[PDB]
Amino acid sequence: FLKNNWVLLSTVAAVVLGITTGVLVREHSNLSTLEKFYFAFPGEILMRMLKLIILPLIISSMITGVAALDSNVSGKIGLRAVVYYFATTLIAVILGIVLVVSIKPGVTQKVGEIARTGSTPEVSTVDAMLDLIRNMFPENLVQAAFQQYKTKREEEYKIVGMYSDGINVLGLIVFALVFGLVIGKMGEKGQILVDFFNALSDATMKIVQIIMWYMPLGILFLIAGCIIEVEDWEIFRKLGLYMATVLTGLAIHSIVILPLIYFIVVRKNPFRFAMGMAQALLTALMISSSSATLPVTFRCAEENNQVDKRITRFVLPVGATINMDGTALYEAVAAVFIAQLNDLDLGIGQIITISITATSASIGAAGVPQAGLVTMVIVLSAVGLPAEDVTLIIAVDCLLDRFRTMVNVLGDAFGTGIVEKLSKKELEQMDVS
Amino acid sequence: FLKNNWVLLSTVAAVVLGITTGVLVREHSNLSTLEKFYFAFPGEILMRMLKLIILPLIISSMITGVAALDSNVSGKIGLRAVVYYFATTLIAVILGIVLVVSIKPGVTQKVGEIARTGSTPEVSTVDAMLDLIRNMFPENLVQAAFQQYKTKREEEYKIVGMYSDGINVLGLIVFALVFGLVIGKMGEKGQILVDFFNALSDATMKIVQIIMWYMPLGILFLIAGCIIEVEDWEIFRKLGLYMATVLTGLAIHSIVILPLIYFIVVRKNPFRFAMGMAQALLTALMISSSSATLPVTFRCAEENNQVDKRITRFVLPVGATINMDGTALYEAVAAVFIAQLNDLDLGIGQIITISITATSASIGAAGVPQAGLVTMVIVLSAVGLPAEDVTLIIAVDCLLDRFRTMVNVLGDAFGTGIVEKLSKKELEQMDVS
Amino acid sequence: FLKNNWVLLSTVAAVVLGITTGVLVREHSNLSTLEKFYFAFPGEILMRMLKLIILPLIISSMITGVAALDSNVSGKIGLRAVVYYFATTLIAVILGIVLVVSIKPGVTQKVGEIARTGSTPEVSTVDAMLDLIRNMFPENLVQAAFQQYKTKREEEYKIVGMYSDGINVLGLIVFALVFGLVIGKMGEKGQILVDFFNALSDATMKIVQIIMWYMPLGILFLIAGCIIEVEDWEIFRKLGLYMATVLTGLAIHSIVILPLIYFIVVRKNPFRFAMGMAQALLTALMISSSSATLPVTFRCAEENNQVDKRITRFVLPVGATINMDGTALYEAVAAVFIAQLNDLDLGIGQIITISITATSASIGAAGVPQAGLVTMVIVLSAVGLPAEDVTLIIAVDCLLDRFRTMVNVLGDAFGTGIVEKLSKKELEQMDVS
Ligand code: NA
Ligand code: NA
Ligand code: NA
Ligand code: NA
Ligand code: NA
Ligand code: NA
């Protein structure tokens, strides 16, 4: 049985050992902040090693995937993927809103009882959306590989912009799509670039295979340091009903809505598809990042589920960037819970604008130093609530982010198969002629 | 008639509509600073899309152009282009000085009457020239793609340098020329690099062709927001004679001096050459940037005027970087006008040093966050005037910069044809053997 | 005799003329700080031109060298090189410690008599080593080409990290080694990348050949400005015995230890090997940088000593990065001298930990804005001395750094030949089959 499922067994054992070690250490010892930081060093090393891979993999994969297909086939496949992503995000938002409204978690809990943690950023909604469009079209290609643009209102007001660290994934993907479309039409004139980027993609995948050897040791310390950070369980008991509502929404979505759509589109049992993606699901639940787990999702979807490479290389990065089913559900539930916490009544129009803002904000927001907090503030402003109410939820974000990430990865994995089945005729036509 | 001149007709219609919209909006409505900024969003998007193209196009074009020619042919062509650029800049400076001296605009106008706008930077002349030489030879190739070097005097004085945003075009072009010279001599060993950069150049040109579709909508809002910014026309009336002198100099240069030299060198009617470049001229007059309009100039000069690609790819980027006929004329006229504004008499030696400083400063200065203001301050210091007198002219810089840009582009376009005619024998000899 | 040794003769003449000019200028004239800075402009230009070459040369050379060999041959060659580097650094540290202890320079000199210069940085040992491991694995490939990571302790303490300028050579070399290993195994799939990087390496070497023409003029002003900076010779007389001890250690190492090991391993006379590397030795003694002189060492070792390119391309960059025989000897001598300056007795265990800290700190530290000062502070903290005692030695660092650099380059040059002789069978086996 070994030498075939060694990676999965090692990951499971590392997760179990890390949970046990975190519980034992935190319970039977007292550590300072500096010692707690020093305890999680291998996890940080694994984090930066996985971050090192994102740029070459995304660029080469997008260019190769777009360049392989014809222009007409590419347009159709992209349209189907976009429609699927939008529909799934909207359904997730609707389910979240319905659940949080029905359960009514915030009615009993008082605002004064709940403690406050973290700091609230200052957000302008229009400036945030305009910054999103600006980052769609960067000014410098080299700067976009490690930096992003942001505008702030300053003084009777003037807008001033600056650049800060953090890779601009959206602009890079837009440019990679346009470049692959252009070099596909050149034919014999652009073949050398196609070969260059194909070789680069293969090399990056082999490097990821190398990193997979060290992954378990970093995973152990990552989950252990996640457990050690929480000082007390009283806040967890105080936020029990809200976390239960969020987890119920995520579980219902992942177990019912996506498998039902998959079975309706492609007449196959979706649980074998989910079993194929189990390794990527555990990776997403541990690392808690959708872009860093992309090569694992690539490998799972291609080797286990026998999905076509032409569909996968195109679909997976775009889904990793713009498909946020777990996030939008979270935002909606948190917004309505905060509204119920105060003595504020919610009308039908308020629910509608909350849903629209959550759907657009999650899809648009691909990466920001504080992306979730900014989008949560935007939703709260849309409903009219103060931005300072975000502090109430921050205590359990480190715990819920992992489940949100794994839900996003599951959505992308299901979507790749659905789009592959939808465009079965085009692939046959293209390969025969 | 359509489907052949659609781009030109759309650009003309967009310019007319933008002027009309700007006039109507500013006259029949009152807007705040924030609303004025929000009104020009499509123009800013077009700006950053055009800036995204500069780096790959310049690098690939320079490498391909130098690598195609032989070393001896390259040296001759470069020498002819450099001599033409220097001579045209010197003639422009002389014409400017003669005109501003003859008209005497500053005699009547009092210094106290003219209002003051903007902020005056602090400039050291020797430090500025040394920074120019430093930027000729950058320390890092990756950093030079999006940043530039500057030194300031601080304390009995010590020099401290730092890096700020803004692409270092001069250093990139120097390195690209050296690299293309080196890989041309390698022969069979460097062929793969030649193929790589040829394909990159073709892809970049196709991407520019894509951007040309959205250009008109951005142009409309660019010219409209340019018109809306000016608060009142009283300052325009107060600076009427100075603007008239500058426009007279630019028009005389563009209509007489360049066509005469072109007709003398190559026995052809230069107005058909200008008609071929009309699209690039309108692009430069709208965007007001010489580097961003380079692909349009490439396309016009190659498709319409049937200029050789070997000459064009070498000549156009260098001219875009170091040929500043419109700027030097502006600087000279502004300097002498400021001198006439005060009770200061100008001697022959003062005129000579003004002309020399304007010629060297404009040619050397290719790109700086505030390039024109810094060079104007340098010229004022050379004649001995205070740097605070720059504030008087800033009011109409946004209007005059477009005409200066279009004059620079026209000079480059004429120079490419003149150099092509001068080196007709070398091309034939190289292609036969 | 000319046209064959023109570069060497020009360099020697430039060194002599620069020493003469520096002595005459400083003695018969008085210059301000600004004028002293302006006097060394050509040297600074040569400095930045040599820095421009490091990134492409290192990346292409490492990728090409690793990709050429088989995986098993690569592992053996790397292991032999690593063992040689560690052994030579340890021997250098032991010799330094023995010499400084025997001579006893600090017994007579009082602490109060010695003047203090410069500023002492704040260093945390554990944070420094963790930063070294972090820089081994960077987060962004584009950012690693011009920036480095550093963590500081801030407030009951929290760790905050930031990025500052300075190329991350260690992370780039680790990635280049892994990439070359991966693309070597791909075979026919990775051939285009191999060709690309081979051509890039050849082009970079030709560009270095171009820079060699301007090198002498910059060297003259570099050595002249080095001489002019020192205000008085009294401090040199006060630090005479310490400088004599350091120079004795360096000379003994370079003349006895390395040639003896070379002769023992490969039965050849090592002084002809040293004569071959004379040009690189003078380059290192003038520029005082090990990475900037790497192409000169490449050319000397390949053309003059007939060393195999497969061994050289692999060995020389790693040695330039991690082989610091001169530095560790310096650190040990300085530490023990500072200890003798105070009324502090040194035990055997203290000597052992000093030697271990010097050996590990010099090898690990490849490049930092203040690398020597930080490692000296680390050693002083390891022995328990205050970090403020570093100010005593800074006066002669600009003089001693050149000798340290030339010792490092000599060690790398000897190591390449020793490793080539050790792995003679593998090369024959690989080329026959
Ligand atoms: Na979705
Ligand atoms: Na996703
Ligand atoms: Na000119
Ligand atoms: Na120009
Ligand atoms: Na060593
Ligand atoms: Na070295």
Residue numbers in the entry:
A (entry chain A), B (entry chain C), C (entry chain B): 14 to 168, 199 to 476
List sentences quoted exactly from the publication behind this structure.
EAAT3-X was predominantly found in OFS in NaCl buffer and iOFS in NMDG, NaCl/glutamate, and KCl buffers. In contrast to iOFS-Na+, OFS-Na+ shows wide-open HP2 and a fully solvent-exposed substrate-binding site. R447 interacts with Y373, already in place for glutamate coordination. In contrast, in OFS-Apo and OFS-Na+, E374 is buried and proximal to G415. It is likely protonated with pKa-s of 9.2, 10.0, and 7.6 for OFS-ApoK, OFS-ApoNMDG, and OFS-Na+, respectively. In contrast, OFS-Na+ and OFS-Apo feature fully open HP2-s, and only transmitter binding can close the gate. hEAAT3g in the IFS, bound to Na+ ions or apo, also pictures an open HP2. Na+ ions bind with high affinity to OFS-Apo, and OFS-Na+ might be the resting state in cells under physiologic conditions. The neurotransmitter and Na2 bind to OFS-Na+, promoting HP2 closure and transition into iOFS*-Glu and IFS-Glu.
